[PDB]
Structure formats: structure tokens, C-alpha cells
């Protein structure tokens, strides 16, 4: 069973002895710190998961306190654990955390350098608790960053799909999550997959579905979808001389639904030109528009291989020119590039297709490690800092400001998030939100004293995270 | 509760229909595929997966119904192999008819060798081998963390030995700071445990319980820490009271080591004036068992470390060790915990050596660099089918993409062997059977729902030792 007393950085166990004496309040905040491709705005997503799974309800028991005590005695070779402080929460509050958390609504898209949530203790005895839970709350960096990076890729796709086709039809199925095997754990898989689904509807990372169902909720039965597809084992199992037999068997098994077939086991160019393009062409051209063959290269330079596959297919199948002047494969045939795709190569591929006059309608992308694993907390500088304390009954605005790195300076005092007169966002420091010169604080209480006080459905989050181009 | 029918990539739900008719066996293997660095990998983490996810009754009527219901909506179609899963439930009481063979955990093996193999033990379950690819492939993560952590240990060992003449304290020179910087609680535990294969210092408490549950140590815990400040415990005192914060903290932790982050406002002032002058009397009185550890946390990592050491060296009595390198007094050390990864680690220790500072003076903390900034393509961790039996005939299968020879996979039944020179070699096409290379070094670790061979964390650590550690004795 999970024990919140064992879910912090070891050193935090010692901090209750380090704050100034007579400190009744520690108030801290989370931001994606501004830094002097660009990631200028971030999608706030994932806190509700943490609140529900780890923070709410009776999270302290006698047994958990004793367990922590025993572990820390050996871990520190010393007795430093705040057993009294934890027992207080158990006795006074039936083990519920005396903490208030206020947050911007999930799905909200906020520029860098703004407060996204704040945390403070609601009982003076628990001044130490605010930053105890920094570690667990800061892991929100991950769904924020996956959702943000996924959305930035959607912006790239949208721009190029609109340019080459005139519309955004199918945009929400253009970047598929292939990342299940390439992330660090089962738990990460569900979190990351759910964050990508804020922007798209295609996923193979099945763990994302149950997470969304349990913690967020959707009107539709499921938040994400997939279609049948081969992997190398289901092609290569037929033997090297029988690739065509594998292809034939698979497209016939899935004759009436879309099917993707990985075509690079031995020679992608041969497979396209000779196997699909000649030997099995009759099984392709007969397919429904709702059930295309999707040819999947999976190796070589991603741009070069996409362009060469399209060049080959365009000579073996009847290509049209759309109203924008771009080439379009027949509706029973598409391509998916699912190798080496990240935000940078995604851009390179669609720009390269555009240069060669191929519509983005022809292609979808799969992304695995690039989508869910190749991200860190420093990409958006997700960071949690104390900005206000009360000591001897007096509030003081606190902050760090390292001489050699102005980028790490933190905000001062009690914070609030507001709309500016021009409709942008601003974070007011030093309790200036209290002056009421800037309309209502956009932070809402989402957790208080062990209870989740405000929740968002996955549908609401998706609405909040829409692109401007989708809104237009 | 975890449901293995829902723990695969969606497309694998459709694969049972795609294999050749009358296929009775699908046999697959995992390697860290060969491509100048990461030439050898530490095999670690499979035992966790076997125990937590694969062993025992993992199929129930309810889990089958749940998966049926989810996949119906996910695919907008009924493609799920209900019958196949029911067969496992009915015939094997929901235990997986799979056999997995693996190299011992902690073993250090060159790239491009077979690390584990997987095959079905019932012909009806030919589709099961690759169903569990997704979950088994996540072993990439503890393998990669453990390997990258060990590569850092090699750097530290080299420079510690050169500047001090011994390896004392090596296993405490790289501390895990990564708890907040990983992607989940589960990842934190797995990654922290992988780092503990090589070192003993961690703040990622999640790692302790994982090791105790799945591996075990003779000692009460596998890893340790010591008291330390964070910015909030300094800055809460107010900008004009940094000295008061420092004094309070070192007085609270007067007889144990304590680290105090010193860069809240001006690291150089803190070292030269606050520690070096105002509070100097509280430092020089401390025990060798209870040093103050000064922690910079910003700026160029190498430049900041060198400047902090120059400042301290002028305020405190420095000695010259037997190798000719400068050593701070034993009540004073430094920890650099910002911007540390395998690359910057190398730059800092080399820069220190050039300025004649012993590596004894310093320890490193690493967070995202240690536990998060790693992907499956670093060591090209990969699972592939190499052998099938169809119509009663075994055939050796592989991929070999024309545009990427680095993606070629191995053929046939595989085994791992010692060469005459004592190195490793992977034999393909069942050639291990010829018995020209001795016995297969893989061991059956999982069979028909049961874990059949396992390793303690102590054994794993011994297996993962550096050669330099083995040399002496
Ligand atoms: N191809 C593959 N591979 C996988 N999934 C099948 C898969 C995914 C997306 C696409 S698509 O062309 O975007 C598409 C087509 C029609 C409807 C649609 O809509 C929707 F997807 F939502 F159903 C999405 C096709 C087929 N899985 C995979 C996991 C890990 N590693 C490699 C591979
Ligand atoms: N300084 C800090 N910060 C943290 N940990 C305390 C910490 C860690 C290592 C060291 S050391 O100098 O290597 C050391 C000293 C003596 C014995 C020893 O051995 C042993 F490790 F076993 F105690 C290790 C000191 C103090 N936590 C932290 C989490 C996340 N982000 C930033 C910070």
C-alpha cells in the first residue's frame, strides 16, 4: 500500500527542524518558469490525478507512521523523523491533510512564468506539510509536459494540413501514441497516454483509458481509439520468402476495417513498388474509403523514406491533385510514419512533404519515446517554490534569486492569476491581487483538508486545451 | 487492479489472427542491439516485472469481461481474443503458459547479446509470447538507469583513484535527487532501485520498499541519506537573515553530516563571508563524522565548483594529500547537485583534477539526468521474434531492413555462451545445441506462472561491480 510518509525526498524529513521558529504558515507555488522549440505556453493537466490517487482522504494511519519511523531510522542512521507532527494530523483530522491547494482549471493553456497552483497549510501546526508534498506534486511536470509537447505537435500538423488541404479534417487522428513499451513504468504509461489524449484521439497505450475513466471521465465510452495493424513478428513469422503471403493474409483478415501493415521487414521499396504496387494491387484498389490499407515504413531516414514511399505509390496508384494543388493518394491507401518521430522530425517531414507537393492528408504519424519518454522537468522548467511565510504572526514575502542565474529567481508573496485588459494572463505577486484591480483570481480551490473540492471532466479539459486554429 | 489483458499495445490485440495458420510456437528475445559509448549493459529489473505483473493467477473471468468491453469500444469492433484468454483461465487456472530464460540480474554484458528469451509452452498460446512484449520491454528502463549510473561510477572511480590513491567513499559519490523529476511514483521506485545497484546514496525513498519487496538485502535498507536544507528552509528566514538560517540549521544538526544549499542569493558571498567568516567558528569545531557539506545549486557547474573550492581553500586550512592534490579539512565538503549528468560529471571531475583538487572534496547529486533523461533508444533495447514452429516445422525468422542494417535481428533459437577467451557470445540458429561452446548461460526464470530463479539485491550488486573494484582484492 502507498504511504505518503514515504513519498517525499529523504531530506524533507529533516526540514521541520529548519524553518524559522514560530512559523505558522508556509505558502508555495508551482510555475513553468520562464527562460531567457520555444514552448511559450503550457497545458495545465494532471493534478486531479495526483489529488485523488495520493492526497485525498485518510492518508495517515498509526501503522503508516510506525512504518515510516522504522524506515527512516535505518535510512538516516538517526531518529530525525517528525512523528509528533504526523500523529497530530492523525488525531486532529483523522489522517486527512490540513492543506489547501488552489489551481488554474485543467486544460487551461497558460504562458510560461505564471502561477499554476499554490499550496499552503490550513493549521499552524502543519507549517512543515506544505513542502513535504512538493515531491509528489512536482511530478505534475510530466502530464503537463506531455500534454504541452503533444499540443505543439498538433499545431504543426494543423498548419500543414490546413495549407495543403484547405481544412483540418482528421487532425485529431494524425499523431498516434506508440509509447507504451518505451516509457519507464506502467504508471507512467497511463499518465502520459492520458495527457496525449488531451489533444488527439489515437492511442495504443491502453493504460491511458482506465486512468481517464477513473479520475476524469468522458461522455463517450472511451477517450481514445485504435485500428488493426501488423508488427514485424506477424510478417516475419511467415518466413523471408513469404512476405507477400503475410501481406495477403493480413489485408484479407481485415478486409472491412482500416489496417496498417509494416512493410520494411526486408525492403520497404520493393514492398511498395512490387508487392503492394503489383502483386497485391487488386486487393488494395477494391477497399472501402472507410477501410484503407495504411502502409507503414519503419526504418531509414524518416523524411527521405516517407518521400520515396509516396513517390513509389504515386506511380503505382491513381493520384489526384486537390484544390490546393497538392497530390493525394486514392482514398483506399494511406501511409503512417511511426519511426523516429518527435516534435523536430515531425516538422521536418511535413515541411518536406509540402515542398514536394504532397498533401498532409496522405499521412499519419506514430510516436513512442519521443511522445512519452524523451521529456524532462527542465523542458518547461516546472518548479515549486515557497513565496510566503508567516512567522510570529507577521507575513513575509520570500524568494530565491541566485547571483549567477537570474532565470532561477522565484516569485514573492501571495500570488494570484488574472486576465489582463487585453485578454492575456498575468501573475500578481505580494498579495496585490487583493487590490482587485484585475478582476477575479483564476485559481480555484481544488483540495482542502483532505477533500477534493473541484473537479474537471476530460471533456472540459479537452475543450480548454483546443488550438486557436480549431476555435477559428 | 492491474489487468494484463489491458497491459499491451492495442494493435497486439489483433495479432492472433495474423500469424501463419497452424503456428504452435512463437519464440522471441530481448537484446540491447549493437550500433562509441555504452558498450556493456547491466541486466537488471526483469525480476520486478515477473513478480509484480506476470506470476500467478493473472487472468480471471472479470478481467476477461473488462477487456472485452474496453476493446469493443476502443476498436469500434469485436476483435478481442476472448476464447484464447478463456482457454488460459480454464486450463491453467489463469497462469501464463510461458517460459522465460534470462541472464542473471546484475550481470554486465556487451551490447548485441541475448539477455532473455520468451516462448509459449502450450501450442494454443502461440499468440501469448508477443502479447507480453510491451510489459517486458519496459525492462529497458531499469537496465538503462543501472547502466548509465554504472558508467558514471567508472568516471568517478578513475578520478577518485587518480587524485586520492584509493576508492574510499566511491559508493556515496553520486546521490539520487530524481524523485520529483521522474514521470510517476512507480518509475521513481524502479529507477531509484536501479541506481542503488551501483551506489548507496538516495533521496528517492520509493526505491527502498521496491528492493525490500522484490529483491532483498541482508542490511535493513539498501540506501541512505543525511539531513540537508532546501531553498525554502533558507529563504523562509527572510533575505536579510541567511546567516541566521545557516546558524540555526548547523546547530540543529551539530553531530551528524548536514548539507546546506548556499546559493539562494549569492553563493560566493555565502562561502567567503558567511561560512568563511561569520560562522567559521561553528564549522571548524565539527567532527569528521559530521561535516558541513556546502551545496552550490546554480551557475555553470564546473566554474561554480572551482570558484567555491578556491574560496573555501582560502578561508579554511587545506592540506595536500599523498598524490599531490588539495584536500579541504575533514569537517568540510561540497556537493554539486545542479546540472549533473554523465557528460557534465566528466567535465567537472577533469576540471577539478586540472586545478589540483582531489575528488575526495566533492560528491554529486543528479535528478533528471540520472532517472529521467534516458530513453529506450540509448541502448537500443529491443524484443523480436526469432523462431516459430508452423505445421510442425521450425523456421528461423528475422527482420533485416534494407535502409538500416543496425535494425537486423537475430535468427533462430538463441543461447549465450562463454568464448575461449572468457567473453560472451550469442549463438543463433540453435547452434548452442552443437555443444562447441559449453553450456547456455541463460537460466529459466519464469515457467507456467511461477518464478523459477531469482536473485537477492546483494547478489545483483556483486554481479555489477566495476573491474577496478574487483582489482583489490
Ligand atoms: N500502424 C501501426 N501501429 C500501431 N497501431 C495501429 C495504428 C495506429 C494508427 C493508425 S492511423 O493511420 O493513424 C489511423 C487510421 C485510421 C483510423 C485511425 O483512428 C484511430 F487510430 F483513432 F482509431 C488512425 C493506423 C494504425 N501500434 C504500434 C504500437 C507500438 N509500436 C508500433 C506500433
Ligand atoms: N544536499 C542535498 N540534498 C539532498 N540530499 C541530502 C544529501 C545527499 C548527499 C550528500 S553527500 O554529500 O553525498 C553525503 C555526505 C555524507 C554521507 C553520505 O552518505 C549517505 F548518502 F548515505 F548519507 C552522503 C549530502 C546530503 N536531497 C535533494 C533531493 C532533491 N533535490 C535536491 C536535493
Coordinates of N, CA, C and O in Angstrom, one line a residue, chain B residues 139-227:
Chain B
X139 N 11.6 -3.3 -19.3 CA 12.8 -3.6 -18.6 C 13.9 -2.7 -19.1 O 15.0 -2.6 -18.4
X140 N 13.7 -2.1 -20.3 CA 14.7 -1.1 -20.8 C 15.1 -0.1 -19.7 O 16.2 0.3 -19.6
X141 N 14.1 0.3 -19.0 CA 14.3 1.4 -18.1 C 15.3 1.1 -16.9 O 16.3 1.8 -16.7
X142 N 15.0 0.1 -16.1 CA 16.0 -0.3 -15.1 C 17.3 -0.7 -15.6 O 18.4 -0.4 -15.0
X143 N 17.3 -1.3 -16.8 CA 18.6 -1.7 -17.4 C 19.4 -0.4 -17.7 O 20.6 -0.3 -17.5
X144 N 18.7 0.6 -18.3 CA 19.4 1.8 -18.8 C 19.8 2.7 -17.6 O 20.9 3.2 -17.6
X145 N 18.9 2.8 -16.6 CA 19.3 3.6 -15.4 C 20.6 2.9 -14.7 O 21.6 3.6 -14.4
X146 N 20.5 1.6 -14.5 CA 21.6 0.9 -13.9 C 22.9 1.1 -14.7 O 24.0 1.2 -14.1
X147 N 22.8 1.0 -16.0 CA 24.0 1.0 -16.8 C 24.6 2.4 -16.9 O 25.8 2.6 -16.7
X148 N 23.7 3.4 -17.1 CA 24.2 4.8 -17.1 C 24.8 5.2 -15.7 O 25.7 6.0 -15.6
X149 N 24.1 4.8 -14.6 CA 24.6 5.0 -13.3 C 26.0 4.4 -13.1 O 26.9 5.0 -12.5
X150 N 26.2 3.2 -13.6 CA 27.5 2.5 -13.5 C 28.6 3.1 -14.4 O 29.7 3.2 -14.0
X151 N 28.2 3.7 -15.5 CA 29.2 4.4 -16.3 C 29.6 5.6 -15.6 O 30.8 6.0 -15.7
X152 N 28.8 6.3 -14.8 CA 29.2 7.4 -14.0 C 30.1 7.0 -12.9 O 31.1 7.7 -12.5
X153 N 29.8 5.8 -12.3 CA 30.7 5.3 -11.3 C 32.1 5.0 -11.8 O 33.1 5.3 -11.1
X154 N 32.2 4.6 -13.1 CA 33.5 4.4 -13.7 C 34.3 5.7 -13.8 O 35.5 5.7 -13.5
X155 N 33.7 6.7 -14.2 CA 34.3 8.1 -14.2 C 34.8 8.5 -12.8 O 35.9 8.9 -12.6
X156 N 33.9 8.4 -11.9 CA 34.2 8.8 -10.5 C 35.4 7.9 -10.0 O 36.3 8.5 -9.4
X157 N 35.3 6.6 -10.2 CA 36.4 5.8 -9.7 C 37.7 6.1 -10.3 O 38.7 6.2 -9.6
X158 N 37.8 6.4 -11.6 CA 39.0 6.8 -12.3 C 39.6 8.0 -11.6 O 40.8 8.0 -11.3
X159 N 38.8 9.0 -11.4 CA 39.3 10.3 -10.9 C 39.5 10.3 -9.4 O 40.5 10.9 -9.0
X160 N 38.7 9.6 -8.7 CA 39.0 9.4 -7.3 C 40.3 8.7 -7.0 O 41.1 9.1 -6.2
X161 N 40.5 7.6 -7.8 CA 41.7 6.8 -7.7 C 43.0 7.7 -8.0 O 44.0 7.7 -7.3
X162 N 42.9 8.4 -9.1 CA 44.0 9.3 -9.6 C 44.3 10.4 -8.6 O 45.5 10.7 -8.4
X163 N 43.3 11.0 -8.0 CA 43.6 12.1 -7.1 C 43.8 11.8 -5.7 O 44.3 12.7 -4.9
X164 N 43.4 10.6 -5.2 CA 43.5 10.3 -3.8 C 44.2 9.0 -3.6 O 44.7 8.7 -2.4
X165 N 44.4 8.1 -4.6 CA 45.1 6.9 -4.4 C 44.3 5.7 -4.0 O 44.8 4.6 -3.9
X166 N 43.0 5.9 -3.7 CA 42.1 4.8 -3.3 C 40.7 5.1 -3.7 O 40.4 6.1 -4.4
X167 N 39.8 4.2 -3.4 CA 38.4 4.3 -3.8 C 37.4 4.5 -2.6 O 36.2 4.3 -2.7
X168 N 38.0 5.0 -1.5 CA 37.2 5.2 -0.3 C 36.0 6.2 -0.6 O 36.3 7.3 -1.0
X169 N 34.8 5.7 -0.3 CA 33.7 6.6 -0.4 C 33.0 6.6 -1.7 O 32.1 7.4 -1.9
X170 N 33.6 5.9 -2.7 CA 33.1 5.9 -4.1 C 31.6 5.7 -4.1 O 30.9 6.3 -4.9
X171 N 31.1 4.7 -3.3 CA 29.7 4.3 -3.4 C 28.7 5.4 -2.8 O 27.5 5.2 -2.8
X172 N 29.3 6.5 -2.3 CA 28.5 7.6 -1.9 C 28.7 8.9 -2.7 O 28.3 10.0 -2.3
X173 N 29.3 8.8 -3.9 CA 29.7 9.9 -4.6 C 28.7 10.4 -5.6 O 28.8 11.5 -6.2
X174 N 27.6 9.6 -5.9 CA 26.6 10.1 -6.8 C 25.2 9.8 -6.2 O 24.8 8.6 -6.1
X175 N 24.6 10.8 -5.7 CA 23.3 10.7 -4.9 C 22.1 10.9 -5.8 O 22.1 11.9 -6.6
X176 N 21.1 10.1 -5.7 CA 19.8 10.2 -6.4 C 19.0 11.3 -5.9 O 18.5 11.3 -4.7
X177 N 18.8 12.4 -6.7 CA 18.0 13.5 -6.4 C 16.7 13.5 -7.2 O 16.0 14.6 -7.4
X178 N 16.4 12.4 -7.9 CA 15.5 12.4 -9.0 C 14.0 12.2 -8.8 O 13.2 12.2 -9.7
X179 N 13.6 12.1 -7.5 CA 12.2 11.7 -7.2 C 11.2 12.7 -7.8 O 10.2 12.2 -8.4
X180 N 11.4 14.0 -7.7 CA 10.4 15.0 -8.3 C 10.5 15.1 -9.8 O 9.6 15.6 -10.4
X181 N 11.6 14.6 -10.3 CA 11.9 14.8 -11.8 C 11.6 13.6 -12.6 O 11.9 13.6 -13.8
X182 N 11.0 12.5 -12.1 CA 10.6 11.5 -12.9 C 9.1 11.5 -13.2 O 8.4 12.4 -12.6
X183 N 8.6 10.6 -14.0 CA 7.3 10.7 -14.6 C 6.1 10.1 -13.7 O 5.0 10.3 -14.0
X184 N 6.5 9.3 -12.7 CA 5.5 8.8 -11.8 C 6.1 8.2 -10.5 O 7.3 8.0 -10.5
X185 N 5.3 7.9 -9.6 CA 5.7 7.2 -8.4 C 6.3 5.8 -8.7 O 7.4 5.5 -8.1
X186 N 5.7 5.1 -9.6 CA 6.2 3.7 -9.9 C 7.6 3.8 -10.5 O 8.5 3.1 -10.2
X187 N 7.7 4.7 -11.5 CA 9.1 5.0 -12.1 C 10.1 5.4 -11.1 O 11.2 4.9 -11.1
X188 N 9.7 6.2 -10.1 CA 10.6 6.6 -9.1 C 11.3 5.4 -8.3 O 12.5 5.3 -8.2
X189 N 10.4 4.5 -7.9 CA 10.9 3.3 -7.2 C 11.8 2.4 -8.1 O 12.8 2.0 -7.7
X190 N 11.3 2.2 -9.3 CA 12.1 1.4 -10.2 C 13.5 2.0 -10.5 O 14.6 1.4 -10.4
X191 N 13.5 3.3 -10.9 CA 14.7 4.0 -11.3 C 15.7 4.1 -10.1 O 16.9 3.9 -10.2
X192 N 15.1 4.5 -8.9 CA 16.0 4.6 -7.7 C 16.6 3.2 -7.4 O 17.8 3.2 -7.0
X193 N 15.8 2.1 -7.5 CA 16.4 0.8 -7.2 C 17.6 0.5 -8.2 O 18.6 -0.1 -7.8
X194 N 17.4 0.9 -9.4 CA 18.5 0.7 -10.4 C 19.8 1.4 -10.1 O 20.9 0.9 -10.4
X195 N 19.6 2.7 -9.7 CA 20.8 3.4 -9.3 C 21.5 2.8 -8.1 O 22.7 2.7 -8.0
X196 N 20.7 2.2 -7.2 CA 21.2 1.6 -5.9 C 22.0 0.3 -6.2 O 22.7 -0.3 -5.4
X197 N 21.9 -0.2 -7.5 CA 22.8 -1.3 -7.9 C 24.2 -0.9 -7.8 O 25.1 -1.7 -7.5
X198 N 24.5 0.4 -8.0 CA 25.8 0.9 -8.1 C 26.3 1.8 -6.9 O 27.5 1.8 -6.6
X199 N 25.3 2.5 -6.3 CA 25.7 3.4 -5.2 C 24.7 3.2 -4.0 O 23.8 2.4 -4.1
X200 N 25.0 3.8 -2.9 CA 24.3 3.7 -1.7 C 23.5 4.9 -1.2 O 22.7 4.9 -0.3
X201 N 23.7 6.0 -1.9 CA 23.0 7.3 -1.6 C 21.8 7.6 -2.4 O 21.9 7.7 -3.6
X202 N 20.7 7.8 -1.7 CA 19.5 8.2 -2.4 C 18.5 9.0 -1.6 O 18.4 8.8 -0.4
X203 N 17.8 9.9 -2.2 CA 16.7 10.6 -1.6 C 15.3 10.0 -2.1 O 14.3 10.4 -1.7
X204 N 15.4 9.1 -3.1 CA 14.2 8.6 -3.7 C 13.7 7.4 -2.9 O 14.0 6.2 -3.2
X205 N 12.9 7.7 -1.8 CA 12.6 6.7 -0.8 C 11.9 5.5 -1.4 O 12.0 4.4 -0.9
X206 N 11.1 5.8 -2.4 CA 10.3 4.7 -3.1 C 11.2 3.5 -3.5 O 10.7 2.4 -3.5
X207 N 12.5 3.7 -3.7 CA 13.4 2.6 -4.1 C 13.6 1.6 -3.0 O 13.8 0.4 -3.3
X208 N 13.5 2.1 -1.8 CA 13.8 1.2 -0.6 C 12.8 0.0 -0.6 O 13.2 -1.1 -0.4
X209 N 11.5 0.4 -0.7 CA 10.4 -0.6 -0.5 C 10.4 -1.6 -1.6 O 10.0 -2.8 -1.5
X210 N 10.7 -1.1 -2.8 CA 10.7 -1.9 -4.0 C 11.8 -3.0 -3.8 O 11.6 -4.2 -4.0
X211 N 13.0 -2.6 -3.5 CA 14.1 -3.5 -3.2 C 13.7 -4.5 -2.1 O 14.0 -5.7 -2.3
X212 N 13.1 -4.1 -1.1 CA 12.8 -5.0 0.1 C 11.8 -6.0 -0.3 O 11.9 -7.2 0.1
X213 N 10.8 -5.6 -1.2 CA 9.8 -6.5 -1.6 C 10.2 -7.5 -2.6 O 9.8 -8.7 -2.5
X214 N 10.9 -7.1 -3.6 CA 11.2 -7.9 -4.8 C 12.6 -8.5 -4.9 O 12.8 -9.5 -5.6
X215 N 13.5 -8.0 -4.1 CA 14.9 -8.5 -4.2 C 15.5 -8.9 -2.9 O 16.0 -10.0 -2.7
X216 N 15.5 -7.9 -2.0 CA 16.0 -8.2 -0.6 C 17.5 -7.9 -0.4 O 18.3 -8.1 -1.3
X217 N 17.8 -7.4 0.8 CA 19.2 -7.2 1.2 C 19.4 -7.7 2.6 O 18.4 -7.8 3.4
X218 N 20.6 -8.1 2.9 CA 21.0 -8.5 4.3 C 20.8 -7.3 5.2 O 20.2 -7.5 6.3
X219 N 21.3 -6.2 4.8 CA 21.1 -4.9 5.6 C 19.6 -4.5 5.6 O 18.8 -4.8 4.7
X220 N 19.3 -3.8 6.7 CA 17.9 -3.3 6.8 C 17.4 -2.4 5.6 O 16.3 -2.7 5.2
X221 N 18.3 -1.5 5.1 CA 17.9 -0.8 3.9 C 19.1 -0.8 2.9 O 20.2 -0.9 3.3
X222 N 18.7 -0.6 1.6 CA 19.8 -0.6 0.6 C 20.5 0.7 0.4 O 21.5 0.9 -0.2
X223 N 19.8 1.8 0.8 CA 20.3 3.1 0.6 C 20.1 4.1 1.7 O 19.2 3.9 2.5
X224 N 20.8 5.2 1.7 CA 20.9 6.1 2.9 C 20.9 7.6 2.5 O 21.1 7.9 1.3
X225 N 20.6 8.4 3.4 CA 20.8 9.9 3.2 C 21.1 10.6 4.5 O 21.4 9.9 5.5
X226 N 21.3 11.9 4.4 CA 21.7 12.7 5.6 C 20.9 14.0 5.6 O 20.4 14.4 4.5
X227 N 20.8 14.7 6.7 CA 19.9 15.9 6.7 C 20.5 17.0 5.8 O 21.7 17.0 5.6

